[PDB]
Design an enzyme around this catalytic site. Structure first.
Site, PDB file in Angstrom:
ATOM      1  N   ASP A 258      -5.970   5.003   0.965  1.00 22.95           N
ATOM      2  CA  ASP A 258      -6.397   3.614   1.050  1.00 22.95           C
ATOM      3  C   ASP A 258      -7.758   3.511   1.717  1.00 22.95           C
ATOM      4  O   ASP A 258      -8.022   4.176   2.723  1.00 22.95           O
ATOM      5  CB  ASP A 258      -5.374   2.808   1.846  1.00 22.95           C
TER       6      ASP A 258
ATOM      7  N   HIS B 165       0.823  -1.201   0.000  1.00 25.43           N
ATOM      8  CA  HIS B 165       0.000   0.000   0.000  1.00 25.43           C
ATOM      9  C   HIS B 165       0.859   1.254   0.000  1.00 25.43           C
ATOM     10  O   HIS B 165       0.565   2.214  -0.721  1.00 25.43           O
ATOM     11  CB  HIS B 165      -0.950  -0.013   1.197  1.00 25.43           C
TER      12      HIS B 165
END
Ligand SMILES: O=c1ccn([C@@H]2O[C@H](COP(=O)(O)OP(=O)(O)O)[C@@H](O)[C@H]2O)c(=O)[nH]1
Length: 449
Positions: free
Chosen positions: A119, A14
């Site tokens: 995210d 991520h």
């Protein structure tokens, strides 16, 4: 002025995704503020490849300390195979809310618009966006749209309004993630649904345009726009010990073996993998490295190879226990296949480079990612049998998959379709390509007046 704030979830894939999204947005001369903890910024910078960050222009890093947390080592015996040892970091990461809230207020004072790309798993940290009139949020959905859309489609009762035979043969999600992560995902996703202006997907319509088109229908995403802006990994790479090894080999002759950062094998499964690679009789590079902790600089990493093993494979195999240049390896002419847990960023890596995948999905989105690569796109083969995922994968099963991809006539047929997918993926990012058009339109969206 328009300004972008990147807020990744603090885990390797991520963090790296949004660094490379920054690489893609940077030629548009939009300032970017990249936000994480000191440890995770250290981690993201240290492991970054194929982007000279020191020459990135309007690019600002913010390191915000968070409270201490348990950096537990991975537990290979977790029945779900999910990195449950990260749960203390999931908890701790929610305390980025305070400094990020202050930063968004600070930036919104001077910018025409503050665009927050985050995210989905960290949606709670940026939720102050719904209180700031000139701030808007685009949630990053990190896995294949096939996985993401198929899950939404099942949650809606499987409407027949979208036709696709693959949706009738989805692998079971049962036991793919612990119940705690279910709750976290649902909670954070519901939050993102309340205030996101759009969702960004790290995928190309050349890979999954059919499912991007399904997801964008109002039935499934109602009024939240979906952008397919990937792959975020570069589509070409400009000497590492792994690459020196590849330089010595014949074209397409080496199996690259690597399982990302979230996989922890039992000592027994490591032994079967060792023996399977030897039984394959193929050349290979094996990345044998314990899964990441929530702080990769904490503690000591855990495995014994079988007696006399590293001597018997010296000409055939390279075994490495550290961080490698994965994309560059996949771009090397000598690489003939990629045995992968089918984390989405590794799938994109392989698809971009035209390398066929020996799929060994373990947890989370990986089985549906793998069925996209192997069953829908036809550019891989399965190592394990998903309906038998609790069983040890035997060295025989491993050797059979490796020989198939690298040595057999059917492997050359899979490789030819992989090579054609690669060409289409790399073209989607060039001028006139479908991803470049999506990115141009996304930039137009976020800088409207
Ligand atoms: O030795 C390694 C292992 C992995 N990667 C990179 O780490 C990421 C792995 O992400 P993936 O989605 O495959 O899996 P996760 O680590 O989240 O399970 C990708 O960017 C890979 O290119 C790398 O550069 N070197």
């Amino acid at each position: 002025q328009i300004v972008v704030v990147m807020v990744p979830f603090p885990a390797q894939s991520h963090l790296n995704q949004l660094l490379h999204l920054s690489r893609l947005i940077s030629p548009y001369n939009i300032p970017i503020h990249y936000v994480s903890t000191p440890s995770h910024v250290r981690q993201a910078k240290s492991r970054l490849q194929n982007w000279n960050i020191n020459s990135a222009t309007n690019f600002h890093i913010h390191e915000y300390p968070i409270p201490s947390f348990e950096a537990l080592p991975p537990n290979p015996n977790d029945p779900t195979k999910f990195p449950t040892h990260l749960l203390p970091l999931f908890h701790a990461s929610r305390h980025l809310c305070e400094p990020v809230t202050a930063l968004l207020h600070s930036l919104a004072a001077t910018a025409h618009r503050v665009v927050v790309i985050h995210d989905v798993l960290i949606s709670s940290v940026v939720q102050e966006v719904k209180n700031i009139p000139n701030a808007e949020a685009y949630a990053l959905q990190s896995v294949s749209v096939f996985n993401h859309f198929a899950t939404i489609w099942e949650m809606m009762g499987k409407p027949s309004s979208v036709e696709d035979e693959a949706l009738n043969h989805l692998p079971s999600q049962e036991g793919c993630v612990p119940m705690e992560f279910i709750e976290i995902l649902m909670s954070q996703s519901h939050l993102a649904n309340q205030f996101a202006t759009g969702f960004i997907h790290n995928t190309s319509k050349a890979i999954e345009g059919k499912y991007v088109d399904f997801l964008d229908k109002e039935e499934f995403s109602g009024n939240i726009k979906q952008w397919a802006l990937g792959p975020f990994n570069p589509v070409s790479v400009s000497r590492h010990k792994c690459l020196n090894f590849l330089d010595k080999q014949s074209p397409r002759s080496v199996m690259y073996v690597s399982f990302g950062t979230t996989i922890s094998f039992t000592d027994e499964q490591i032994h079967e993998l060792a023996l399977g690679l030897e039984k394959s009789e193929q050349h290979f590079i094996w990345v044998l490295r314990e899964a990441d902790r929530g702080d990769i600089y904490a503690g000591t990493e855990r495995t014994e190879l079988p007696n006399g093993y590293e001597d018997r494979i010296k000409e055939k195999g390279m075994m490495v226990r550290d961080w490698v240049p994965q994309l560059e390896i996949l771009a090397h002419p000598s690489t003939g296949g990629f045995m992968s847990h089918c984390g989405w960023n590794s799938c994109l890596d392989s698809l971009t480079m035209g390398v066929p995948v020996a799929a060994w999905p373990m947890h989370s989105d990986q089985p549906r990612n793998a069925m996209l690569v192997v069953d829908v796109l036809k550019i891989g083969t399965f190592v394990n049998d998903w309906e038998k995922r609790s069983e040890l994968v035997s060295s025989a099963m491993i050797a059979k998959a490796v020989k198939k991809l690298v040595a057999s006539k059917e492997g050359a047929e899979i490789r030819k379709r992989a090579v054609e997918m690669g060409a289409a993926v790399r073209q989607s990012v060039a001028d006139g390509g479908v991803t470049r058009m999506e990115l141009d339109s996304f930039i137009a969206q976020i800088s409207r007046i």
